[PDB]
């Protein structure tokens, strides 16, 4: 197959943030890592001034600033998810900004089990080394010197296999790590010294001490204090050897603290963000002893107020704090000495739009296509209306998690599945609790699921239906069925109990929203979770646990089973085209079914037998089936045209592979441009808020753009010196192959921005530059 993938909206979720002096010795810089993007801001009188935004050929997992001795300004260390390590330097020579790759390498190991808590990258305070926790039982040390241009690292065996979090401590004569680990005896905190010349671990300054069961975060405190602050679930502790200081404030019991940031350079004040979005300030009280040394007297936590749910926090300057969110919009907030009379010392200054996570979306015409996405989660959950302008985004906050969306044109309303958390009592007012009209279904923290009928124009919750206790709503469709002229809202549900592995119960509830009212038209009791539902030629195609069932709508306004298919593990996704059905499995990739109208049953055509942990499926055409899996890869499967035997004909062949670097949640047919080298248009929405487009090209077009990819890869310089072929290579923990049948549209589009001499070098002996500029412009206009 020949496919063209291009980013329409860059990822918006913030995965990392740091402050330092990177662009110059005087500039105060905020660096933000959004997956594959690195943004550099200068803190100024007017706020954050962006100076350079860069794209990397990798998923940024570590991003740390450090200043070696003799360096006039901070150097950056970046590690990617594909273990591409680079030491970068910001270089400015007058109106020209370059990110110089001081050092680059790949620090992956041939053998190694990736750690549960993920890649950890820490830097020694004296910049003697970079430590990487990549695999269980292996601590990778990269010595920092001017001669180690290749990042020639070495591994030290770590006895503690289950390490939770590790930092380098301050004020140690030798490089020292302090980490929290789990063993059969619980969770503990331990220290080691690293010897570069000996290439080994030595005993830490202070012996191990037992910590909380859910101790999850390590904070290395600067001098004068030294030591570390361990943060868990319901306690905060400080360990500096003989000095142990634990507190258990009730205020932190309600939510888990997920991020921290040091405010004062001496470590007397810290910011702590929790999962509910609450911002606390940890305070370390000083005690200057008469001996001349400074010790810690007490720990205090104060509720500063409420922010966006923080993935990361960073104090910039003058009481201003950047809050980088992946579940909601990021924000600059201001800390004030005096409260707002509401008891809150935090005042929001600026909001940065984040579309992540995009759990579902749809294309509507409210001849110009608009995307409506279910974005965010919990109090950050909202609807996002994206249209071409570049992209214009309108936010409709729901204050609860949206899960599914379907447009009902005849009713001029959207149907949205939503969930809220109650303790029952709701934790805050939300869309489901502030509906104009509300109803409840007839026949610790709990999830309450609702169907919201929301006005298309005002985006106000017209109605909210509360489903049964322990009932989760999974699938939603707006369609007409059979001979019934009414358009219905069909919801697939599942009763959830801890006693059950698979749901033994579930429901298909058919509602009608008419005259600004919601009534339950029909209720069907099924024996499992209704994962997916599609309107299939006037009939209702549903997936219930491991079965795909086609129902008919009778004249009595009830569903009657027409046919069943059982050859699935867990039919999560369903797409249809004509009489074809694409069944996405939990692990068994994609299956092609053909409904047979003359037999009234399903027929299996071909299954992709490569195990793929599917996250979203789509049908490109009758032959091509596009799928996304949880290792951030896209694949395209075809029916084997050269199949001569039946066994060959039972196989869907993976003819296209491509490492996207994004976790695709939803595929939809539609375009954001007004109604060309490419045919077709499929939008996809991902966890990080990135939105992409997949199109199809012919043989000649694909060949030309692949040759251009090769030429551009030869010409274009990569940040971190990562090869584009390596980055786009299909990659799981099991299998790695080069990308096939996929043109990286971003690479091709980048051709228009290179210098004309570089254009001539690229198109030399291909063909003038003007024709190919026209080609790339036509590609852009899709």
């Amino acid at each position: 197959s020949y496919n063209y993938v291009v980013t329409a909206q860059k990822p918006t979720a913030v995965n990392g943030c740091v402050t330092g002096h990177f662009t110059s010795a005087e500039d105060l810089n905020l660096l933000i890592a959004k997956n594959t993007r690195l943004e550099i801001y200068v803190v100024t009188a007017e706020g954050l001034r962006p100076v350079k935004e860069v794209g990397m050929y990798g998923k940024i997992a570590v991003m740390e600033l450090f200043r070696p001795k003799g360096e006039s300004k901070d150097l950056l260390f970046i590690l990617t998810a594909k273990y591409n390590a680079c030491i970068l330097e910001y270089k400015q020579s007058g109106e020209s900004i370059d990110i110089i790759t001081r050092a680059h390498g790949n620090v992956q190991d041939r053998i190694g089990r990736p750690s549960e808590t993920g890649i950890i990258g820490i830097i020694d305070p004296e910049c003697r080394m970079i430590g990487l926790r990549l695999y269980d039982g292996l601590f990778k040390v990269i010595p920092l010197d001017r001669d180690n241009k290749e990042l020639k690292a070495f591994n030290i065996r770590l006895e503690e296999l289950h390490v939770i979090d590790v930092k380098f401590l301050y004020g140690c004569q030798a490089p020292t790590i302090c980490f929290v680990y789990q063993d059969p005896q619980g969770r503990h905190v331990k220290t080691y010294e690293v010897s570069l010349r000996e290439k080994e671990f030595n005993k830490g300054p202070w012996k191990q001490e037992n910590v909380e069961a859910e101790a999850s975060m390590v904070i290395a405190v600067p001098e004068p204090f030294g030591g570390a602050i361990i943060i868990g679930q319901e306690s905060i502790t400080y360990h500096n050897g003989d000095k142990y200081l634990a507190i258990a404030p009730p205020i932190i019991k309600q939510s888990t603290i997920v991020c921290h940031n040091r405010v004062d350079p001496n470590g007397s004040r810290y910011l702590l963000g929790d999962m509910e979005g609450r911002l606390f300030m940890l305070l370390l009280e000083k005690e200057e002893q008469m001996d001349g040394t400074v010790t810690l007297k007490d720990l205090r936590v104060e509720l500063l107020g409420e922010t966006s749910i923080a993935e990361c926090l960073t104090y910039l300057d003058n009481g201003v704090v950047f809050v980088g969110s992946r579940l909601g919009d990021s924000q600059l907030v201001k800390l004030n000495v005096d409260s707002n009379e509401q008891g809150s010392y935090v005042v929001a200054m600026e909001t940065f739009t984040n579309l992540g996570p995009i759990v579902d979306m749809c294309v509507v015409d409210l001849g110009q296509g608009q995307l409506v996405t279910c974005s965010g989660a919990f109090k950050e959950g909202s609807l996002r209306i994206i249209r071409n302008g570049k992209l214009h985004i309108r936010t409709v906050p729901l204050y609860e998690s949206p899960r599914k969306i379907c447009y009902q044109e005849v009713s001029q309303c959207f149907g949205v599945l939503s969930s809220r958390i109650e303790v029952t009592t709701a934790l805050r007012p939300s869309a489901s609790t502030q509906a104009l009209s509300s109803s409840v279904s007839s026949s610790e923290e709990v999830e309450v699921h609702n169907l919201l009928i929301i006005d298309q124009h005002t985006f106000e919750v017209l109605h909210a239906h509360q489903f049964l206790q322990n009932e989760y709503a999974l699938s939603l469709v707006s369609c007409k069925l059979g001979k019934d002229p009414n358009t219905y809202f069909i919801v697939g549900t599942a009763m959830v109990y801890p006693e059950e592995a698979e749901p033994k119960q579930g429901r298909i509830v058919v509602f009608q929203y008419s005259d600004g009212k919601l009534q339950t038209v029909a209720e069907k009791e099924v024996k499992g979770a209704v994962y997916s539902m599609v309107e299939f030629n006037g009939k209702l195609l549903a997936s219930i646990n491991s079965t795909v069932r086609l129902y008919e709508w009778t004249t009595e306004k009830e569903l009657r089973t027409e046919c069943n298919h059982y050859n699935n593990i867990m039919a999560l996704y369903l797409k249809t085209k004509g009489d074809f059905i694409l069944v996405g499995d939990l692990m068994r990739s994609v299956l092609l079914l053909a409904y047979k109208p003359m037999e009234g049953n399903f027929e299996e055509i071909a299954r992709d037998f490569n195990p793929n942990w599917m996250s979203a499926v789509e049908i490109l055409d009758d032959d091509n089936f596009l799928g996304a899996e949880n290792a951030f890869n896209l694949f395209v499967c075809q029916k084997d045209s050269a199949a001569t035997t039946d066994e060959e004909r039972q196989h869907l062949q993976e003819v296209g592979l491509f490492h996207l670097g994004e976790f695709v949640n939803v595929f939809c047919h539609g375009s954001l441009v007004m109604q060309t080298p490419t045919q077709g248009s499929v939008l996809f929405g991902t966890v990080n808020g990135m939105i992409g487009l997949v199109t199809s090209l012919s043989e000649s077009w694909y060949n030309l753009l692949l040759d251009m990819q090769n030429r551009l890869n030869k010409v274009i310089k990569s940040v971190g010196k990562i090869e584009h072929s390596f980055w786009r290579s299909f990659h799981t923990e099991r299998k790695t192959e080069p990308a096939t049948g996929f043109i990286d549209g971003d690479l091709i589009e980048s051709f228009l921005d290179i210098s004309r001499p570089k254009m001539q070098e690229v198109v030399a002996n291909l063909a003038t530059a003007d024709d190919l500029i026209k080609v790339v412009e036509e590609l852009t206009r899709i």
């Binding site: 803190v43 009188a45 104090y315 003058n318 000495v337 409260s339």
Partner: peptide, 19 residues
């Protein structure tokens, strides 16, 4: 009121002044 937010670090007092 909040004596623990009194002395928040200042790198440059001009920063965020003209927000």
């Amino acid at each position: 009121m909040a004596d623990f937010l009194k002395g928040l670090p200042v790198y440059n007092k001009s920063n965020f002044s003209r927000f």
